[PDB]
RNA sequence: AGGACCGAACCGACUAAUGUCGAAAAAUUAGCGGAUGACUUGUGGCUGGGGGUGAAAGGCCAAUCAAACCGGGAGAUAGCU
RNA sequence: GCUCGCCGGAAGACCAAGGGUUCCUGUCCAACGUUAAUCGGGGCAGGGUGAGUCGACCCCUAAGGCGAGGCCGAAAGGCGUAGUCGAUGGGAAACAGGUUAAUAUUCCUGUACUUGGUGUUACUGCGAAGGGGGGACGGAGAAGGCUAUGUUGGCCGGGCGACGGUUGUCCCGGUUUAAGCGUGUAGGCUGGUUUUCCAGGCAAAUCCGGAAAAUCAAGGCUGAGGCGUGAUGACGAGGCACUACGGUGCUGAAGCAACAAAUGCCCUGCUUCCAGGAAAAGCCUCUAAGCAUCAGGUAACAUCAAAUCGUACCCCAAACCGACACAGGUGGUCAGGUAGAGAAUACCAAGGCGCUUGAGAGAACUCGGGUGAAGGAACUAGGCAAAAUGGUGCCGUAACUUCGGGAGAAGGCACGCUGAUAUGUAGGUGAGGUCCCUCGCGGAUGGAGCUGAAAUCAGUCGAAGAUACCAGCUGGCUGCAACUGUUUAUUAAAAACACAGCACUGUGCAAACACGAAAGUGGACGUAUACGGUGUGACGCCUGCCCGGUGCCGGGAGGUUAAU
């Protein structure tokens, strides 16, 4: 899993890689790809609107089912293979229908192993269910957030969201955030933590490890000039001022949420 | 050196041809100002 | 079908050089000045019928009209079509 | 003549 | 294997001389740095002015940038020559 | 015309972009050419660009543009669905010779190949804006087989050398031939086949997917090159006939082998890695409605069409961008000999050029070089600049270290040529012969040849043997920045910026945040192991006290407090 690159060049030398072996060594499958062009951050009037994306490689979106929504029908996950796309390894798996999917790939499910969906299902890791039929306090994942939406919370690597309780219609989540949430019962979660546990240890190394998962650098306000940035100018390192992103609005604690339209849906807030 | 002007028939046209003025208003009204004063080669279209 | 009246207008001269001259003594070709549009099939019927000598391929390029400066200003001369027309085998002027 | 070269810089008499 | 090493193409511009009404509105000569990559390049496209873009120098945005260029307000205003 | 010099991974040859007659011929020297000009990319006139196969066009899509209706917007207008454009990509097909003053894969000769139209000929389920397959893909590495190509040998032709020798393991030249068709190789991948069933492929489908069970162990697809043919043909060193003195008409020998060998082809292959590597059509099948003598499909033959535009010329340049015939810039393709690791470099081939002012002189002084007595940094701000070092093989190699490095540390030794070991070695390559059988482009053996290191021993020459070109100066202490990178195009390349790493903080998804009056879009087709912002800047040891102030976060009990 984790291994540390030897350091037999400076750029080498820090590098933990996480080479999974089990991963599939192919290609993914064709008919389940797609195009992905990349933006840069840049949107239809064509600005940047999030700084600090571009560059880095070609890469096609996977077509992950999070809905998950064949029931009955049991599957096999034929394999695991590496999806740029996400921090999880996919799983391409198969109905006894002949038709196959993507899924994301729990902690504990290796190739041949076998899950399927729907109300009846049972509790092993891989099977998704309502989470009126899921038990309490069981780690579940790939949560949705409305019935047929598609499932939305806990799809990174390693992690996992937790049923507290179920009051009525609602469960309630401690979300991967420590966030104590609320959503309805009806809506399906798959069991299990998510795999690629281990994602978080890599550490990359070098800068081109970054630049080519398409991340061009960040310049500190401190460096920028007063017009570029509320951080600016100076005599040498110069500052005197109160942490504020580019637009001036204040960075380093400051709430910015405001939704007044889903604020009743959340027990607690954030740790 | 390398100099500004690096000529190349495609992007001069689709930049300053004749259908890339009458595509828009601003454009067209450029038209209607080469017409006004009555120039000869009203847009690039070599 | 393609009209008498187009094909009395598809051909205007004979063009007539040292390339002319060659093209006639060793291909078969008579080399002409023909229409601007001048399709090679309607070349090929023109010929066919107002000349009524028997025509084997067309083969037909578009000169470039010379830039003239006559006295001081910046001229032109027309494009024109000129067309190489390979008799089959018999005679032509 | 359209272009107009600039002048080389004084000598800086602070 | 490697933002690995030496070193041409290629990319650049550290030193020195020349050049400074130049051969050249930034170059030549001798060297010099990278040279499998955060590289370089072709073609086309996208972002436009208080806007863009910026590995951030107020840099670049047609030999012009602490706010482009063109036209208009415009014969601004100028207790200053 | 003869010498001389230069280039030759270019200053050669062919294109693209770009230019637009600059191409060729005749005529002229007013202007243009940094001089002269008979010359010219100059002036005037005439000629020249021939395509089923090359490109465009056209079918298909990327980024992206426009965008019915649509959503939004004081108006203009913005976004965007269906859709339609858009190559820098995907999609059918021609080669070798001959020719012009100038085009030629376009003309001519020969040899082909592609796609459709139509008609007859039979046999047949055909049928799509729909399904499936395909096209369809990364980086790096390595090896095997090849080829281009060159070298030598063998032939063929010619020569017997301006002064020594030169009919001999002597000299010079040529020894070339394609596409297509047949073959199916080196080699690459893949089990194959028959039935039967099925909640998948928005319906259907025999197609795909998926199960079963038998089935034979083979097949299928891909495939460089070679071989045969193309070709009793062309080309051909040259010889002769006539000279528009330019070249035309004929005749025209050999036209093999081995070895070396690509960065090219098999190979989009193989192995491997993480950064996870366009789409749509053409293509092949499946069926839907509709029709099932028909239509339509397939095959065979015949025949027709392959239109339109480009095609001259420059293209690291006097023709494109730079105002100039401007020491600048300009993408792609080919790349020969000797030496060499090499596309470096030196000298050369093909080929091209002598840079559009020259002639004298041999003052100072300036620029580019060469050498230098003795000293050797005393110069100077500073060893700036020069000088110097420089290769391959082996020996040897410290502190420190993050255990990799440092390190090419430092330093030393050998290097030419000749002969022998060895009538050239080890090695490579491999004929003939022979045997076997899947009988072949087969395997085993076999070694003729053809190449060909490296080492040792002996000798010899010179002042010097990595002899030219080319080609590290070395070490010690230290500040800063971890490092590779980026930066003020055009006086600043750094300690500045970035960076991987760390932290705080926001953000529960219709996320935060950002562009946008809004629709919307980016974030992200991502989901707290994620995204944004801010600071710090690998790594090691660490990061101490202060919340008075400003800010942020949390409270709401009290005072004040807006519109109303
Ligand atoms: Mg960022
Ligand atoms: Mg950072
Ligand atoms: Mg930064
Ligand atoms: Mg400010
Ligand atoms: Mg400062
Ligand atoms: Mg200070
Ligand atoms: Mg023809
Ligand atoms: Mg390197
Ligand atoms: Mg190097
Ligand atoms: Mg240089
Ligand atoms: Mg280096
Ligand atoms: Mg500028
Ligand atoms: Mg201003
Ligand atoms: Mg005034
Ligand atoms: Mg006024
Ligand atoms: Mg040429
Ligand atoms: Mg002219
Ligand atoms: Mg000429
Ligand atoms: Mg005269
Ligand atoms: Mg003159
Ligand atoms: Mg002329
Ligand atoms: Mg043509
Ligand atoms: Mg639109
Ligand atoms: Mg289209
Ligand atoms: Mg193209
Ligand atoms: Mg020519
Ligand atoms: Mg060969
Ligand atoms: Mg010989
Ligand atoms: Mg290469
Ligand atoms: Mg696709
Ligand atoms: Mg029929
Ligand atoms: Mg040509
Ligand atoms: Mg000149
Ligand atoms: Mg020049
Ligand atoms: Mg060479
Ligand atoms: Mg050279
Ligand atoms: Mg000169
Ligand atoms: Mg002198
Ligand atoms: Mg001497
Ligand atoms: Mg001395
Ligand atoms: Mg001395
Ligand atoms: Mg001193
Ligand atoms: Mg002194
Ligand atoms: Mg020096
Ligand atoms: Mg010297
Ligand atoms: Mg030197
Ligand atoms: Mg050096
Ligand atoms: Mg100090
Ligand atoms: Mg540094
Ligand atoms: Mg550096
Ligand atoms: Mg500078
Ligand atoms: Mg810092
Ligand atoms: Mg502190
Ligand atoms: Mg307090
Ligand atoms: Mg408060
Ligand atoms: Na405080």
């Not at chain 1, 504020?244 to 027990?267: E, H, L, M």
């Not at chain 2, 000529?7 to 601003?26: D, E, Q």
């Not at chain 3, 470039?64 to 005679?91: C, M, P």
């Amino acid at each position: 899993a984790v291994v540390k690159c030897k350091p037999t060049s400076p750029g080498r030398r820090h590098v933990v890689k996480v080479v999974n072996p089990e991963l599939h060594k192919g290609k993914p499958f064709a008919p389940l790809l797609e195009k992905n062009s990349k933006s840069g951050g840049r949107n239809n009037n064509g600005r940047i609107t999030t700084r600090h994306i571009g560059g880095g490689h070609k890469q096609a979106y996977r077509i992950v089912d999070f809905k998950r929504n064949k029931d009955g029908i049991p599957a096999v996950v034929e394999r695991l293979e590496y999806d740029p796309n996400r921090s999880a390894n996919i799983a391409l798996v198969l109905y006894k229908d002949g038709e196959r999917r993507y899924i994301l790939a729990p902690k504990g499910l290796k190739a041949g192993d076998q899950i399927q969906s729907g109300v009846d299902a049972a509790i092993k890791p891989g099977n998704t269910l309502p989470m009126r039929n899921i038990p309490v306090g069981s780690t579940v994942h790939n949560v949705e957030m409305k019935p047929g939406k598609g499932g939305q919370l806990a799809r990174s690597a390693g992690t996992y969201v937790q049923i507290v309780a179920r009051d009525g219609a609602y469960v309630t989540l401690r979300l991967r955030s420590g966030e104590m949430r609320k959503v309805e019962a009806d809506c399906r979660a798959t069991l299990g933590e998510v795999g690629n546990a281990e994602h978080m240890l890599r550490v990359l190394g070098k800068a081109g490890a970054a630049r080519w998962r398409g991340v061009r650098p960040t310049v500190r306000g401190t460096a920028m000039n007063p017009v570029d940035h509320p951080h600016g100018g100076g005599e040498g390192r110069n500052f005197g001022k109160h942490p504020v992103t580019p637009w001036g609005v204040q960075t380093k604690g400051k709430k910015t949420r405001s939704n007044k339209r889903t604020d009743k849906f959340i027990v607690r807030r954030r740790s | 050196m390398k100099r500004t002007f690096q000529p190349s028939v495609l992007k001069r046209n689709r930049s300053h041809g004749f259908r890339a003025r009458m595509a828009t208003k601003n454009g067209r009204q450029v038209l209607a100002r080469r017409r006004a004063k009555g120039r000869a080669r009203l847009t690039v279209s070599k | 079908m393609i009209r008498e009246e187009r094909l009395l207008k598809v051909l205007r001269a004979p063009h007539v050089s040292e390339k002319a001259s060659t093209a006639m003594e060793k291909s078969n070709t008579i080399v002409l000045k023909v229409a601007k549009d001048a399709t090679k099939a309607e070349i090929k019927a023109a010929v066919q019928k107002l000349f009524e000598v028997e025509v084997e391929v067309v083969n037909t390029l578009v000169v470039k009209g010379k830039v003239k400066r006559h006295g001081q200003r910046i001229g032109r001369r027309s494009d024109w079509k000129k067309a190489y027309v390979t008799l089959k085998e018999g005679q032509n002027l | 003549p359209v272009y107009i070269p600039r002048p080389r810089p004084p000598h800086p008499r602070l």
